[PDB]
């Protein structure tokens, strides 16, 4: 096989004795990228103001966020300097090397400001038109309010501030496509308020973090794209 082929090997010394992937000196074995990809990382972080929401703005969406196992497309503005100096996370970088996937994501949505009953809902097949989220008044007529019978979840920001949910993989096809260009992905995730708590005069600060589920798998290893060093920022 041409990728791993090694002709005429000239090796001066023996090979180095093994630590069982670090289990000898540390306690754990770092043998796999799928375990590194299950440590949570930031996904999208935004603010939402009154007045760029709906007119009536009782139980409505605040964000429809597209679920991609690679990241959303990043733009490194001056508001969140994360996306600027840290570039992408470890998950978009691991993901850019594989072609397909099959499996779900885990999310952690931390929506505060607001401190009322907030809700989340997964539309497994309404994909996949764009690489940004859509805020408030710009989400389309039929993604505006909650729907009936889509898998959803509800939480009082008074009891607890963090919603942690796991999105299933519901698709007709064999794979979902990593590195899509722009029914390929995991569909949409809608986040929204449950009935018109008055909004603080600055912001509802939402931030989504994500990871890989347990049954998730990266599937066909082609190359990595060209990278950019973070220390050059």
């Amino acid at each position: 096989m041409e990728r791993t082929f090694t002709p005429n090997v000239m090796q001066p010394t023996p090979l180095l004795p093994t630590t069982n992937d670090g289990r000898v000196t540390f306690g754990e074995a770092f043998n796999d990228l799928k375990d590194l990809a299950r440590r949570y990382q930031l996904y999208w972080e935004g603010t939402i103001l009154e007045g760029n929401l709906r007119a009536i703005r009782r139980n409505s969406a605040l964000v429809q966020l597209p679920l991609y196992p690679h990241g959303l497309r990043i733009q490194p503005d001056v508001n969140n300097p994360i996306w600027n100096i840290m570039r992408d996370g470890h998950i978009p970088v691991i993901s850019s090397g594989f072609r397909y996937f099959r499996g779900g994501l885990r999310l952690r949505i931390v929506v505060e400001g607001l401190n009322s009953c907030v809700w989340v809902q997964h539309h497994p097949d309404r994909p996949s038109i764009f690489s940004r989220p859509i805020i408030g008044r710009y989400i389309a007529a039929k993604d505006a309010y909650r729907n009936h019978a889509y898998a959803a979840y509800v939480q009082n920001m008074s009891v607890n501030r963090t919603i942690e949910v796991e999105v299933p993989f519901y698709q007709p096809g064999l794979y979902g496509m990593l590195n899509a260009s722009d029914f390929t992905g995991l569909g949409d995730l809608l986040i929204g308020i449950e009935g018109e708590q008055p909004i603080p005069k600055e912001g509802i600060e939402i931030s989504v973090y994500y990871s890989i589920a347990d049954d998730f798998s990266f599937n066909i290893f082609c190359g990595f794209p060209p990278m950019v060093y973070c220390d050059e920022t």
Binding site: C117, A151, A152, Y153, V154, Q155, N156, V159, N160
Partner: peptide, 11 residues
């Protein structure tokens, strides 16, 4: 233990 207001809405 992690407090949450209710059980699963989907199941």
């Amino acid at each position: 233990f992690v407090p949450i207001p209710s059980h699963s809405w989907a199941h």
